[PDB]
Design an enzyme around this catalytic site. Structure first.
Site, PDB file in Angstrom:
ATOM      1  N   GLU A   1       0.801  -1.210   0.000  1.00 48.13           N
ATOM      2  CA  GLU A   1       0.000   0.000   0.000  1.00 48.13           C
ATOM      3  C   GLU A   1       0.839   1.266   0.000  1.00 48.13           C
ATOM      4  OE1 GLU A   1      -3.112  -0.376  -0.960  1.00 48.13           O
ATOM      5  OE2 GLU A   1      -2.972  -2.468  -0.530  1.00 48.13           O
TER       6      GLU A   1
ATOM      7  N   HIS B   1       1.963   2.192  -3.364  1.00 45.35           N
ATOM      8  CA  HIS B   1       0.928   2.981  -4.060  1.00 45.35           C
ATOM      9  C   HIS B   1       1.018   4.432  -3.573  1.00 45.35           C
ATOM     10  CE1 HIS B   1      -1.024  -0.069  -6.285  1.00 45.35           C
ATOM     11  NE2 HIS B   1      -1.560  -0.668  -5.257  1.00 45.35           N
TER      12      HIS B   1
END
Ligand code: RSS
Ligand code: CA
Ligand code: CA
Ligand code: ZN
Ligand code: ZN
Length: 166
Positions: free
Chosen positions: A121, A124
């Protein structure tokens, strides 16, 4: 590796982050140690630096949530989507949300490894898109390799440096 359309990236030497909410599955100190561990996995390859703040706004807001939680990407209960994060930018940009309905673990129990999930994550949050390489951390699904023994692959490293230089 792939980047987001138009290659958004943090345009500053330091990027702040704040853990707004915690999971009931782990001690709070473990989530803090693991978010730090995760950020620094990418951090070591690039010139950015990270700073944790405990109040107000930060470029990266991290939190756990079950179901609907304001951002129009409701979580879906145990399994399926594990978490989601957004490309660099203001507001929701850069944030990382983890589905509280998952059984999170540091690796010593059965469940979903938070360090592995957080590395993906925060990748990202830094601007990384998905990889076609089953071995890269940025691959779209969880569990191809070993959540408890892993590291960024050359593909993940190539992409982050394409975005921020070495
Ligand atoms: C890499 C990860 C830490 C973050 C990603 C989210 C992300 O890309 O940021 C994730 O949650 N991927 C899903 C992708 C996924 C796999 N399937 C799904 C079925 C429904 C919805 C999503 C999925 C098949 C069934 C298995 C469901 C549990 C495991 N889920 C996943 O691997
Ligand atoms: Ca943000
Ligand atoms: Ca889920
Ligand atoms: Zn969300
Ligand atoms: Zn992803």
């Amino acid at each position: 590796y792939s980047l987001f359309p138009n290659s958004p990236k943090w345009t500053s030497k330091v990027v702040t982050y704040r853990i707004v909410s915690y999971t009931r599955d782990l001690p709070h100190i473990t989530v803090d140690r693991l978010v730090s561990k995760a950020l620094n996995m990418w951090g070591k390859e690039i010139p950015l630096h990270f700073r944790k703040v405990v109040w107000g706004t930060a470029d990266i807001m991290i939190g756990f949530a079950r179901g609907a939680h304001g951002d129009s990407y409701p979580f879906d209960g145990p399994g399926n989507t594990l978490a989601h994060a957004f490309a660099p930018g203001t507001g929701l940009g850069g944030d990382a949300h983890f589905d509280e309905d998952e059984r999170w673990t540091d690796g010593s129990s059965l469940g979903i490894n938070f360090l592995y999930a957080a590395t993906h994550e925060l990748g990202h949050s830094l601007g990384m898109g998905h990889s076609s390489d089953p071995n890269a951390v940025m691959y779209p699904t969880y569990g191809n390799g070993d959540p408890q023994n892993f590291k960024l692959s050359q593909d993940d490293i190539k992409g982050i440096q394409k975005l921020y230089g070495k």
